[PDB]
Structure 1
Amino acid sequence: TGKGKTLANLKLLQHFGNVRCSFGLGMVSLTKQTAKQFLDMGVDYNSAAMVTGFSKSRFNLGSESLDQDEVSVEYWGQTSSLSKVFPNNNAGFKNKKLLSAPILVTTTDHLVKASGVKKGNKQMLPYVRCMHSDLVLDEIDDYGIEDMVVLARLVYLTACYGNKVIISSATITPAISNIFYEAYSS
């Protein structure tokens, strides 16, 4: 920690060319931190899309003009061609930010539904998202055991279409690193 892991992940993604990735992170605030790093280093909202699907009421006080912080939800971005095959032209704000994002800095639960769902059509949007985009999962050790199982299911599904999985965990256990490699290998 403290060495700039997420910046190194973006560097590794950009080494192969232009970036198309889903930064799936635990917690809302860690996604906010990675979004703020992406904003102040080089990434605008035409490429980045911070997705936290709860609409929290945590606002910044003191000075709105002198903030230079509090990464928000606008996504000027670019609507992908996949929105025409989704129901009713995808959706409003949230699913447009999901599907059409080049870089999707999101909470992870908007990506683990790609592996499948019980009832409804909630699988298709993260499925089609992870089909054409890379997957970057940071500090996977903080998740639960079943959470890590479904995250490696997501890694297997992402590798099923040739995309690249970046795992960023310092305290990795050989077991975890191995089963994530075996999911990527399958």
Structure 2
Amino acid sequence: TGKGKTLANLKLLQHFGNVRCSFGLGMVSLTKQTAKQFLDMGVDYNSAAMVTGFSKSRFNLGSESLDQDEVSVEYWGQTSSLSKVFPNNNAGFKNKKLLSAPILVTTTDHLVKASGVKKGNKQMLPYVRCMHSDLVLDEIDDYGIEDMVVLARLVYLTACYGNKVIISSATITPAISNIFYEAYSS
């Protein structure tokens, strides 16, 4: 920690060319931190899309003009061609930010539904998202055991279409690193 892991992940993604990735992170505030790093280093909202699907009421006080912080939800971005095959032209704000994002800095639960769902059509949007985009999962050790199982299911599904999985965990256990490699290998 403290060495700039997420910046190194973006560097590794950009080494192969232009970036198309889903930064799936635990917690809302860690996604906010990675979004703020992406904003102040080089990434605008035409490429980045911070997705936290709860609409929290945590606002910044003191000075709105002198903030230079509090990464928000606008996504000027670019609507992908996949929105025409989704129901009713995808959706409003949230699913447009999901599907059409080049870089999707999101909470992870908007990506683990790609592996499948009980009832409804909630699988298709993260499925089609992870089909054409890379997957970057940071500090996977903080998740639960079943959470890590479904995250490696997501890694297997992402590798099923040739995309690249970046795992960023310092305290990795050989077991975890191995089963994530075996999911990527399958």
State the alpha-carbon separation in 2 of the partners of residues 171 and 50 from structure 1: 26
Please list the CA deviations of residues 129-168 of structure 1 after superposition, one character each: whole Å capped at 9, or x if unmatched: 0000000000000000000000000000000000000000
Aligned residues: 186
In structure 1, how many angstroms separate the alpha carbons of the residues matched to 2:20 and 2:181?
21
Q: SS at the partner of 1:154?
A: helix
Secondary structure of 1:78's aligned partner: coil
User: SS in structure 1 opposite 2:137?
Assistant: strand
Q: For residues 106-133 of structure 1, what are the alpha-carbon distances to aligned partners after superposition, in whole Å with 9 as ceiling and x for unaligned? A: 0000000000000000000000000000
SS state at 1:97 partner: helix
TM-score by length of 1: 1.00
CA distance in 2, matches of 1:68, 1:124: 36
Matches of 1:179 and 1:19 in 2, distance apart?
26
**Counterpart Cα distance in 2 of 1:94 and 1:6:** 24
Sequence identity (%) = 100
Deviations 1:2-33 (A, max 9, x none): 00000000000000000000000000000000
Partners of 1:14 and 1:131 in 2: how far apart? 18
Q: Cα RMSD (Å) of the superposition?
A: 0.0
Aligned mates of 1:46, 1:24 — CA distance in 2: 19
Point out where structure 1 has 5 or more consecutive residues left out of the alignment: none
Aligned to 1:121: 121
> Corresponding residue for 2:179?
179
Structure 1 residues 1-186: aligned runs within 5 Å: 1-186=1-186
Whole-Å separation in 1 of the counterparts to 2:62 and 2:127: 41
CA distance in 1, matches of 2:57, 2:108: 20
Structure 1 runs (4+) deviating above 3 angstroms are none
Superimposed CA distance per residue, residues 66-125 of structure 1 (whole angstroms, 9 cap, x where no aligned partner):
000000000000000000000000000000000000000000000000000000000000
Unpaired runs of at least 5, structure 2 = none
Q: SS state of the match for residue 55, structure 1?
A: coil
Structure 2 CA distance, aligned partners of 1:100 and 1:91?
Answer: 11
Partner of 1:22, secondary structure, is strand
Post-superposition CA distance 1:18-61 (Å, at most 9, x none): 00000000000000000000000000000000000000000000
- Look up the SS of the partner of 2:2 in the other structure: coil
